[PDB]
Amino acid sequence: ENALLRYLLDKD
Amino acid sequence: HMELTPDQQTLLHFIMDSYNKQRMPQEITNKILKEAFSAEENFLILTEMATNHVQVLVEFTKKLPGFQTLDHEDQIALLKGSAVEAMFLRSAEIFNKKLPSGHSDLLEARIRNSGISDEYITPMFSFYKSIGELKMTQEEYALLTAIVILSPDRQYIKDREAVEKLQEPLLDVLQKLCKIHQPENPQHFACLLGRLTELRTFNHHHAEMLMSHKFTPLLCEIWD
Ligand SMILES: O=C(O)c1ccc(CN2C(=O)C3(CCN(S(=O)(=O)c4cccs4)CC3)c3cc(Br)ccc32)cc1
C-alpha cells in the first residue's frame, strides 16, 4: 500500500 | 535543426508551465537562516526539504502530457522509481541558480554537518558542479526532469510501451533544442545524456544511506 503517493496523485 | 514543430512547441509549453509552478516556501528558507547549527536541526531541515520535494514531484508529474492516461499502478511505479533521481536533479538546479550565494552557503554548511557520511556528500556536490558547468537552460532542466520521470525501464511497470511512447518525443524535443541553441557544439546532447547516467548512481548512494535520530518513517516507506 503506497497510501501517500495514491492520496497525492488522486487529489484536487 | 531549424525550429520546433507546433506540436513540439505545444508539448514543450506544457512541460515548462508545470515546471515553473514550483517555489521554495518561506517557512523552509527561514529555517535554513535561523534554526540551530546542530546535527539534529540540520537533518530535520533536510528531511522537511526532502518531503516538500515529493509533493512538488507528484504535482509536476500529474501535469506531464499523457501521464494521466497511464494505468494507475504504472503511475505509482514511475513516481517511486524516479523520486530519488528527480530530487537530485531539482536540488542541482536550486543550488546553481535559485538560492542566493549566502543562503546556499548556509544550506551547504547544514548539509555537510547533518550526520551524513562524505561517501554520499562528495558525489552529491560533484554532481552539482558537473551540472553547473553545462550552463543548462530552464527548458533543459524541465525536459531532463520529464525524461527521468517517464523512464520505461523502471521496475514493476506493466505496460512499458505506453511509457516509451511518452518519453521518445521528449528526447526528440531535447535533441532538437540542442541543435537550435548549440549548433557549434554537436556533443551538447551527449553531455546532457551523461547527466542521466550520473543521476542513476544516486539510487545506490541513497538506499545505502537509508540503511543507517536519523530515522524518518514517512520518507522511508515512499523510497523503499
Ligand atoms: O520546499 C521545496 O519547494 C523544495 C523543493 C525541492 C527540494 C529538493 N532538495 C532536496 O531534497 C535537497 C537535496 C537532498 N537532501 S539530502 O540531504 O540528501 C536528504 C536529507 C534527507 C533525505 S535525502 C535534502 C535537501 C536539496 C538541496 C538543495 Br541546495 C536544493 C534542493 C534540495 C527541496 C525543497
Side-chain angles (χ1 to χ4, degrees), chain A, chain B residues 2-100 102-224:
Chain A
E1 284 183 61
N2 311 287
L4 193 70
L5 271 169
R6 186 124 41 237
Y7 174 86
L8 295 168
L9 195 63
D10 315 295
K11 81 151 184 77
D12 291 334
Chain B
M2 179 90 265
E3 270 173 48
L4 293 178
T5 71
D7 166 58
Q8 287 175 313
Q9 254 199 94
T10 301
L11 175 65
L12 183 56
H13 180 78
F14 275 74
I15 310 293
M16 274 262 85
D17 172 82
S18 179
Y19 197 83
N20 294 339
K21 298 300 169 185
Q22 359 265 209
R23 226 164 308 280
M24 192 86 72
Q26 191 93 307
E27 296 84 19
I28 275 85
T29 53
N30 290 351
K31 279 191 84 197
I32 302 163
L33 191 93
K34 72 174 183 288
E35 291 280 9
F37 196 78
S38 69
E40 199 209 358
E41 278 291 334
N42 289 342
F43 191 82
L44 188 73
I45 282 162
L46 299 170
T47 288
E48 207 168 306
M49 291 189 78
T51 312
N52 276 62
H53 177 262
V54 180
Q55 296 162 51
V56 165
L57 165 70
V58 180
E59 289 311 304
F60 168 72
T61 303
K62 275 167 69 160
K63 284 152 82 180
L64 293 181
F67 190 78
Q68 303 278 55
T69 75
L70 294 160
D71 176 31
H72 186 73
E73 273 292 302
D74 294 2
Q75 283 184 59
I76 296 301
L78 291 169
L79 286 163
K80 278 188 113 292
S82 74
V84 173
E85 278 169 56
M87 178 179 287
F88 284 96
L89 185 52
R90 186 85 69 165
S91 71
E93 193 216 356
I94 303 170
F95 188 81
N96 289 297
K97 299 195 154 69
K98 268 87 188 79
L99 269 162
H103 220 82
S104 183
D105 285 336
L106 244 150
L107 187 51
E108 173 161 22
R110 291 199 188 273
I111 289 154
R112 293 179 180 274
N113 294 267
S114 65
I116 312 170
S117 177
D118 294 287
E119 201 194 306
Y120 190 91
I121 304 309
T122 303
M124 188 207 285
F125 284 102
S126 169
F127 170 78
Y128 294 169
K129 289 195 275 178
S130 177
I131 282 287
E133 288 163 53
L134 292 185
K135 302 286 182 177
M136 286 175 78
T137 54
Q138 210 85 337
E139 283 85 28
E140 288 177 329
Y141 279 111
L143 287 156
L144 258 214
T145 305
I147 287 158
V148 158
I149 292 159
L150 303 160
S151 278
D153 45 65
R154 305 273 185 220
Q155 287 182 320
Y156 314 111
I157 300 169
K158 275 112 186 73
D159 189 354
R160 312 188 166 275
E161 302 113 287
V163 188
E164 280 185 345
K165 260 184 76 66
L166 294 180
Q167 198 195 53
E168 166 120 58
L170 298 172
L171 295 154
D172 288 1
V173 174
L174 181 65
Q175 193 225 63
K176 216 172 188 180
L177 281 178
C178 292
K179 284 182 177 291
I180 290 158
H181 295 100
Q182 236 97 96
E184 327 90 355
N185 195 17
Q187 239 50 253
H188 192 61
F189 185 64
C191 287
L192 256 44
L193 283 172
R195 307 310 118 225
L196 291 172
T197 48
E198 203 186 354
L199 272 172
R200 292 258 170 159
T201 76
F202 284 103
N203 292 319
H204 156 244
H205 294 130
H206 197 85
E208 209 178 57
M209 186 239 157
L210 284 172
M211 231 66 178
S212 60
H213 92 296
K214 290 218 278 173
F215 200 76
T216 60
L218 186 75
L219 283 151
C220 283
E221 59 190 37
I222 299 153
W223 289 320
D224 185 75

